[PDB]
Amino acid sequence: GLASLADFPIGVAVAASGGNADIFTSSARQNIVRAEFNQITAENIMKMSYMYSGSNFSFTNSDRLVSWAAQNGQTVHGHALVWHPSYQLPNWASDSNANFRQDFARHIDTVAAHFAGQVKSWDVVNEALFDSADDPDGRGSANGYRQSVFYRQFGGPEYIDEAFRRARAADPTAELYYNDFNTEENGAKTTALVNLVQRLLNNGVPIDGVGFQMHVMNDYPSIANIRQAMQKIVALSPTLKIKITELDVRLNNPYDGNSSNNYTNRNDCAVSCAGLDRQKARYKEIVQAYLEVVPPGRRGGITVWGIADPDSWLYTHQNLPDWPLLFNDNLQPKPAYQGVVEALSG
């Protein structure tokens, strides 16, 4: 399968929260993972609050998934030690908590140590950069940083430095990533990423790599911009790894000012459409760009954000249907899959 075609991880995000996508109950999905991939990311169940049951640590469900991975030919990318969304904040992660910095330290120390030897790499900090598209409380930018509870408590970006230092100390063997989205656009957020990463390097922080989520559309951003954004980050260091962490590809572009090039019906791309053929070329060109600009020995992996289209968080988005992944609703490989094959094989 796909993983055989590369010497770096070829991964997939897996569900484990019930319903049709749940990896524990879907033999068809288990079989695809074993055949095609050699790494998993937990789509949800390694987020911060999932490390607790009541006020105590609880690793039962995440341990089950990590063990399944080890039994089925998969390494694990941990997602994520620090992330801002309120739905997954531990209850300690509050401006009302006087003990915040101590509880933060305990979180990273405990979780990273717990998974030592079982989890190859981590998203240590995820989504620390400001994004207007993603500022529902209207807090605004602090010179490009998101003013999450971590930022507010620490009075600035030092929480990022600390998270990386503690993760390194707790599990020296793990590859430590900074992960974010829209950083492939080669715009304002890419520049903020350069600032963020350069500051960490200047501070001697043990960051091993940068993750690009790569939640893209078929025709935006341009491949030239994606390529240059990755190049900018590769240029910051002789050793920093690059990982594509959450790749998926929307046929529909809501935001292009054209409502006549939208597929509005689920049947539009059920069998064949221009969009599935472009999606093949899109997966192909992105994987090719990764290979071209990320040196051998600095390739941390390529992961797609789910197995089959109906599992995707973008199966519906903006009240429109989409088909973002490598396998369709009947779990058959799509042209997208072949695009990855062709890129990885040269």
Contact positions vs Ca ion (CB under 5 A) = 253, 256, 258, 261-262
Q: What does the alpha-carbon distance between residue 128 and residue 181 come to, in Å, rounded to a whole number?
A: 10
* Minimum CB–partner distance for residue 258 and Ca ion (Å): 4
In the complex with Ca ion, the residue whose CB is nearer, 126 or 218, is 218
In the complex with Ca ion, the residue whose CB is nearer, 31 or 261, is 261
Burial of 45 (0-12, 13-18, 19+ CB in 10 A): middle
Q: List active site positions.
A: 127, 246
* Minimum CB–partner distance for residue 254 and Ca ion (Å): 6
* Minimum CB–partner distance for residue 222 and Ca ion (Å): 16
In the complex with Ca ion, the residue whose CB is nearer, 211 or 275, is 275
In the complex with Ca ion, the residue whose CB is nearer, 191 or 253, is 253
Q: Is the dihedral of CA 138, 144, 149, 152 positive or negative?
A: negative
In the complex with Ca ion, the residue whose CB is nearer, 261 or 264, is 261
Query: Mapping DSSP to helix (H, G, I), strand (E, B) and coil, where does residue 72 land?
Result: coil
* Minimum CB–partner distance for residue 251 and Ca ion (Å): 10
* Minimum CB–partner distance for residue 278 and Ca ion (Å): 13
Which residue is associated with the tokens 């994606």?
Answer: 226
* Minimum CB–partner distance for residue 321 and Ca ion (Å): 13
Give yes or no for a contact between 147 and 139, defined as CB atoms under 8 angstroms apart.
yes
329 vs 117, 175, 281, CA distance in Å?
Answer: 35, 34, 20
Q: Write b or e for each residue in 139-148: b if 16 or more Cβ atoms lie within 10 A of its Cβ, otherwise e.
A: eeeeebbbbb
Give yes or no for a contact between 40 and 12, defined as CB atoms under 8 angstroms apart.
yes
* Minimum CB–partner distance for residue 252 and Ca ion (Å): 6
In the complex with Ca ion, the residue whose CB is nearer, 135 or 256, is 256
In the complex with Ca ion, the residue whose CB is nearer, 53 or 261, is 261
Q: What does the alpha-carbon distance between residue 111 and residue 337 come to, in Å, rounded to a whole number?
A: 34
Phi-psi category of residue 269: left, alpha or beta, with phi > 0 → left and psi -120 to 50 → alpha: alpha
Residues in the chain after which the backbone breaks (C–N beyond 2.5 Å): none
DSSP states along 225-289:
HHHHHHHHHHTT-SS-EEEEEEEEEES--TTSS-SSS---SGGGGSS--HHHHHHHHHHHHHHHH
Q: What does the alpha-carbon distance between residue 325 and residue 111 come to, in Å, rounded to a whole number?
A: 30
